[model samples]
Structures are given as structure tokens and as C-alpha cells.
Target: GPGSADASDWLNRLAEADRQNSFQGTFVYERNGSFSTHEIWHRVESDGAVRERLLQLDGARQEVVRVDGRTQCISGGLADQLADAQLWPVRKFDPSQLASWYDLRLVGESRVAGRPAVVLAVTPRDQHRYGFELHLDRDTGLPLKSLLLNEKGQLLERFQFTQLNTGAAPAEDQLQAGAECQVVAWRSEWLPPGFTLTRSFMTPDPVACLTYGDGLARFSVFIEPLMVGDARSQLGPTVVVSKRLQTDDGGQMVTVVGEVPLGTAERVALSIRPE
Candidate 1:
């Protein structure tokens, strides 16, 4: 049987979606070892600016607010930790550019967040980055779920909405930041060519204080400054594997965490020549 033009259509559609549609909803995120529920309120004004508010549904009041993918403020575990406040801009998705790097395909249809979704497979053209399985809303093209997978098809992290409604805009109060949420200050000295910074904020340790995104994929670089014996003095590349590496800057260790390929992760970690 012939399909409706294969997967490229889904990918291309997703690139253009979410530019004008504004709505609010709740979802769940699950991976091999972690599972959590979250609520999100997203708005795309006529001026093309996007604002999103997110909070953990079942946890201890963890929250974040962003305008056009830039983190405006955050609270809870995300704010208990603070780092330099720096923002990386958002880049529009480019289908042609992505085509060169990934072999895109529409796997099939499924239900996510109670809505029909079209699954898009972003298979790597090379081994530089991990592959992605994206579930976009069939009605509006908004992403309902996303999965990051390694070469062996193992899940690393997952982002998805369990209950979503694109019906109406959220109330003004729904978009407001929490009482304890504070703005973070930080900046990135280096990034890949088309890769721009979206938001950098403080999060709990073991987690990076800085976060960056290119609109589609996001990563956080955690820095933990510690005082130890001679072991702490050694600063260089520590291989998590053939593809992942941790770069040390003085006594502070920087770990690059994202859904990109192991090679891309290594490059990103090594490229951080911070000021």
C-alpha cells in the first residue's frame, strides 16, 4: 500500500508547526529509569514570539517559564541552584539542513496525550548524533512527545505530554512565574555553527546549572567545582565512552548533556572555552 508521501512530509510539517498555535496541556515524561508528570502552557503570539510555562504535576513544585524558548525565570529545584545568566537565541528549524544530516521518515500513527500523532523518525545520516523519534500532533503538528535513542535503540531521555488541549489560550495567571522563581544569569562562549543558545538557568547538582537549545534539541552543561586531592587537579577529557567526554576547567568539571550523538557531545564538551 502507498502512504501519503512518506516521512519527509511529517518532518517538514513539524518544522513549520508551533509558530502560531498557542495552547495549554499536561503530559508525562518517562525513560528507562525515570518517570515524571508535567504541565505545560505554551503561547505563540501574532508577533511570532513563543512563551512556555512548565511545572511538575506530581512533584515538589518545580517550575519554569520561557519566552520564545528563552528561560525567563524558574523555581523549586531549578532555582535552588543558580549559575551565570546567559541566553542562547532560538533558531528556526531548517528542513533542508536537517535532511542532509538525518534520513527522515514517517514511521506510522499512534496515540499520545490522548491525541492522534504522526511519528517521525530522524535517523542519523552519520554517527555524529543520536537518532530521534518524534510524535507530533496530527491535527496541529505540535509535538506531543519526543524520544532520544542511542545507536542500540536504548532510551536516554523522553519528553512528552500526557494530556494536551490546543483549544484555548491559558489565563494570564497561568503564565506567571512562581513566587520563589528567580532569573539566572549566564552565557555560552562557544556553540556549533547553527546551534544557538535558548536558555541557561540553575538546576540541582548532578545536573548542570546551564542549559542550551537549538529549538529542537536541548542540552545542559553541568559544572561542579570541588576541592579534592591530586585527583581534582587533573583537568582534561574524561571519556564516558568512545563518544562522550567530560572536560575539566580547573577544579570545576563540565559535563555536556544532550540527546546529540556521542561525537557531537564530545565536540560540544571540548569546545567550551568559557570566559
Candidate 2:
């Protein structure tokens, strides 16, 4: 009983640390055919406001700023395409909810970023999702390294911190937003059960995009004017499904993209109705 309770307690602490802690670090993200490094600055004010900034250390100067878990601004091609990439309400972390889909256990202990860390394994109950190995800082309960693995235990992605500092709060300049950031509005007509609209982007173009999440999993739906046929593709844990629908004007295409099963994406794509 202590083992199960301790594992859940650690998971809750890890979630709280992400939102409440003031820390900075440099980390590396690696996936199939892609690798990059980044620097993060996070600060939590006395009034309970949280601010964060992330900047790519290499490549085409990518950056993002978040306030209280909602994205305030972002830089790069994705931001240019989706100008209103904002998060929905911050949901409190509940390990019991996750336990329904995953098996949580204390794997062991390790060292990361030259600090002691506790290892936790989150194994999926079914093939619908991937598993994760989290190495959390023992002192602060913050994640120092995370690894995503497929059902066969093959590595899909790795997020590891190279350096970290939690002693000082970030300065004001570290949380500054770029001039290009702006907000827009978009919505969906219907979504699957337990899923809620979390972010959206709308413009004077043919595309209207919205993101939805079921607490742990997230997916995005894009509707645009097109005369294309249906198509679907799967890459690692991510899936993209598209379907053409008849509209009053001419023809339109609805695409569902995310790290979810193909069936889920297909259902979401077919359920996209105009509002």
C-alpha cells in the first residue's frame, strides 16, 4: 500500500513542481530524425502568477512565452500559421485519473544533470498510448529527464536536462513576449466525450483550427476549403486523418491530427461540423 501511495504522491508533486516552482534549465529534445536544444526560464510570483519562457539554443530561433500555463506568444513558422495558439484552463493534476489508463511504479534511482533523481515508470494499460520513463529531481520533484517508449520498448523521444538551477527566480526580461504575438478566436461544433476545446486559431483564410484534449491526450482539428479526397497517415505515435465533406459553398476538408490512435482521429475528422 505504501508503494502505490508513494508513487501517486510523487506524481502529484511532479505536477505541482511544473506549475509552482521557479527554475531555469537547458534541455535537449530528440526524436526520430530530429534533435534540438533549448533553454527554459520559469518564475512564480508571490501573487501565484506563473511566467515562463523557452528559447531554442540552435536552429531558426524558436521561442515561446507562457503565463499561468497559457501560451502568451510563440515564434517560428507554426506560430505564424496559427496565431491564436492558446491553452485552455489549467486542470489540476490527478494521479487517480491517470491510474485508470496507466500503471505507475517506482522504478529506481538515478542521477541527472549531476543531481540525484528518482525514476518513475508510467506504463500504458493498452496499445492505444505510449509509455514514459520519468526521472524527477529528488530535491524539487521537477522532471530532469523523460523518455517516451513504444509498446515494444523502443525509444521514440527523449527530453533530458543538461543543466538546471532552481536557486533564483527569473528576471523580468526573461519573460518578455515578442511583438508578433496576437490572439484570435475559433471553435468546434462537436467533440468526443471527455474532450474539451483547449486552443484555436482563426484568420481571413480558408483554414479554421481548434485543439482539443481529454486531460492526458490532445488532438487538433483543421477545417479548410478544399476539393481533395480522403487521406490518412501515421508517424510514430502521431496520426493524421483527413476527410472531404460537402459544404454549401463547394467542398471542404477536415483534418484531425495528434498523437492519438488513427480511429480516434478518423472519428474526430468526420464529426467536424460547421458552427
Candidate 3:
């Protein structure tokens, strides 16, 4: 039927639209106890390279710049993790693969960001993860709005565009990064089965960070010289687990964080043996 085929087609196109076109827009992100607005500028150069930038409009001057899948720089509180973390192979969007875990179907049509949009409902087959509702632009196939919902249909987060323009490419100045940005270096020793390291970085405090994933889910492991305190916590879909290890040189702290199950996070944290 048109419903299933159209919805899957839109999903496929969305995976490529971000790199295939130039656009600028303002969007809002909301989750439990958090709400903020952001502006985004995306440019696809004539030579096929993609450059993008994002800035927060409401709070701190949070900003990020990415060029052709690499993180050039970032600002504000977003420095803790690698901004360009891919953490997995860049597999093409396959609705059939997703259908194995989610029940994908077209719900209806709507208008978002003053543009016509089609709604795709992605419901989880099990309780392990949350579901999503995507409002994709009919013309460009870009996601105009997205919602993450729990098993009980409770809203967890939302990403919706308030204003969008795809008429012109972003200016060169808009893609420039600040001077504070610095390149980082780090690597992981081991990862969970089927997971691969995608991004790594180092902070001024000299903390080493590595991100890993297995296609669908991702997690970050942070290793630093042992601090005074050790802790573990979980909030919403995010789980954080930390462990203290005695290295040949001194004590080291290993922390794993991601929107994954607690056991997975714990195992990842405990398995960190830095090189």
C-alpha cells in the first residue's frame, strides 16, 4: 500500500537529505525538565562536501561546526563528549532492518514549519527501547519534526522546526569555528561485541573520551585520572555507570554513559582498560 511504501521511502530519503542539500532553520528541543531553541545552518558545497553549524538561541552560546563528517569545533557545555561521534558503520537506511525491531507505518499527514509534511509512526516491538514519530517534509524529505515516546505513550523528547529555509546555501562565515576549539586524541582498548569505536577526544583536564556503537545504539566511555568521588546514576533513557581501577601508574576512573540499558553501561564501564 501507499502508506507503508511512502513512509519507508521518506525514511530512506531523510537519511541522505542532510548531506544532499543546503538549509537553515530554527528548532526546539524538549524533554523532561528541559526545553531550548536552536538555529542550524547546513551547506552542501558544489564539490559535494557538507558543512554544518548549530547554535543555541535561548541559553549559553552552545555552538558546533562539522565539516564532511568531522567535528571541527564546539563550545559551551557540549564539550564533555565528542560532537562528531558516529560510533558505527554508516549503513544506508533500510526500513526492512528497522521493521525487525519496530512496527513502521504511516499515520497521516500534517503541516510543520509552515510546510506540508507526512507523519511516520515507528513503534517498538519490544520494551527495550522507545518509539518515534517523525514528521518529514514532503518535498525535501527532511525531518521537520520528531518525537520520542515511551512504551506507555509518554513523551520523552521532541525536535521540531519552527522556521526553515532551503532556498540558499549558508554563508562561509556562518560555518567558521571559534579559536577556543582544539583537536583531541584518544583511543579505546576494548569494546562490546559488534561495537566499534567511532569518535575519540581529549579535554583540557586531559580526560580521554571514546564513543562506540553497534549500528543502532551508542555509548561513550570517559577515562580520567581517579577523582575523589565515584558515582552511578540513571535519568530518563540515559544510564551512567562508573568504576575505579588501579593502574600501574595510579588510580583511574572509567565512566560509561549512553541511552542504553544499565547492564550494558555497567559492563562497558568495567571493561575499560586504557592503553
Candidate 4:
């Protein structure tokens, strides 16, 4: 198993070496109920610090600014947390570590963003995590298209570039966060080790405030202050496991978004605590 060359080589190269280079382009991200188009600009400084920005091209107004892989701020409807972004650093992709959990293989080749690519299949070794099919640019080794799929090969989400050009680096002004973008000054009680909080924000629905992401996977915990005997307590959990968890501050409802598993999501949701 470990003797495989294509799988091992691709994983090793991507996790340790691929990220050293940086470029900017427009990409599309879609998951289940939502689809979005955005432009991304990323620059890796000589010191290895990465600055990136994302701006939505359609639908609702949305934008995100990140530095060193951590989100600095976001625009519209997204939750805002007081957690500081500086606390988290850019995480190295460790192929050795990931190999324990996933089976990596070079499936074949594909064309994406009008560039030649090698398709790397990251099959889950365990049921705890999902699998990914990554089409990486053969020329630059950057991921031009990534597909997140469940065990049955059902597509859960996709992040793909429609156009890309690595010639010019992103400008300094392009990566700056907006004036209203607030700094994160809080922390999550728990995270899945290699992950760290990147961004947090509040939502208008259900009148809930929450935080999101360990930088790789994003989950949200919402607290609804219930008025006893207000008579709206008849709601039930959905088939998707929109379950309730008991917290020190009474009953809380938590939902995990993104393409992660229900079990991992539930555990993350229940782990939230007040500081």
C-alpha cells in the first residue's frame, strides 16, 4: 500500500512543495444548495507568508480576505467573531499524516481552466472523512479544480477555476480587507488538531450568533435563548440531524455546514463553549 509511487509522489509533492508558489485567478465554489462564482488573488511573499482575497461575482454580496491561510474578514451575512487571525499560522500539508487517513492515487489527467492537469484521487481510508478528486495544474502544481465527493461518489461540493493566469503576482492593495471587516478576538473550545479558526460571524436567521472554520472545514454553533412557556417549543430535529445539544447556558442548536461528515460536524457543534 505505501509502496505505491503515483499516489505517494503526488501527495508528497502537493502537501510539502506545491503551496510554495502562488498566483491569482477566478474560481467557482458550489455545495448542495448554493452556487457561487468568485475571483481569488493570492500572493506568497518571500518570507513564505500568504495573502489572499476572494470577491463574489454574482448573487449576494460576498468577499473574504485572508492572510497566511487564515481569514482576516468577510462581507455580508457571514458570522463575525472577535478571535484574532494572527493566532493561526499557515498549516503545511503533511502527506505522511494524511496518508494514515486517506488513500492517495494519481487517477489520470484532465483539462481544467484551459490547462493540462493531473487528477489525484484522495480516497478516504475511513468513513470519518470525505474524499476528494483534485485536478492539479501540471505546469504549476496548483489545484485548478477540486471535487469533494461522498462515499457513494456523490458530489458534495466543488471548487474549480474557470480561468487562471500565474504570470503576475497579486497587488498589495488587492489583498487588503475592507474597513468594516472586524478582527477575530475569540477562540473555539476545540478543533481537529491541524485546523485553526480562520473567520467567525453572525447570521440574521434564527437570531443566532456563531463562529466558523478550523480553516479547512467550517461548522457553526447557534444559541437561541428560549423563553420558557413561550409555546414555540414544538420544533423537531430534521432528518439531516439538525439535533439539539444541552449546554451550560440552556438548550442550544448547532448545525455543521460544508461537506464534512454528520458525526464530525455534530461533535464540533457540541464542543462550543462560552469564554
Q: Tell me the alpha-carbon RMSD of every candidate.
A: 6.1, 4.7, 4.7, 5.8
The lDDT values for all models are 0.60, 0.64, 0.63, 0.58
**Candidate 3 per-residue C-alpha lDDT over 149-226 given as tens digits, one digit per residue, 9 for 90 to 100:** 776787766778998888888788877756654442434454555456756766434567777654334567777675
Per-residue alpha-carbon lDDT of model 1 for 197-272, expressed as tens digits?
Answer: 6455444343334565444555566555433342222121222212222333444455554455566665665665
Candidate 3 regions with alpha-carbon error over 4 angstroms: 1-3, 77-99, 178-198, 212-221, 228-275
Model number with the top lDDT: 2
TM-score of each candidate structure, all chains considered together: 0.74, 0.76, 0.75, 0.74
**Per-residue accuracy of model 4 over 1-275 as CA lDDT, tens digit each:** 12378766665555543357667788776666456687777788878777777677786556677666556776654222211111111234555556666666778899998998888877776665678787877777677787878889998777889998788887788777666554532234755544444345443334343444422233444444434343232132211234455667666554445445777666666676654
Candidate number that wins on TM-score, 1 or 3:
3
Tens digit of per-residue lDDT, candidate 2, span 1-275: 11477787788777677666788888886654356788888888778878777777887666777766566666654323332132211223445445666787888899999999989888877766667788888988887887767777887667789999988888888777556544323345555554667666543335677777644445677777752563322222222566676665456666665444556667666656665
Can you give the lDDT of residue 36 in candidate 3? 70
The 10-residue segment of model 3 with minimum total lDDT is 83-92
lDDT, candidate 3, at 219: 63
Clashes of each: 15, 0, 0, 14
- Model 1 segments more than 4 A misplaced: 1-6, 77-92, 184-216, 223-250, 261-264
Q: What ranking of all candidate models by lDDT puts the best one first?
A: 2, 3, 1, 4
Error of 2 at 247 (Å): 6.2
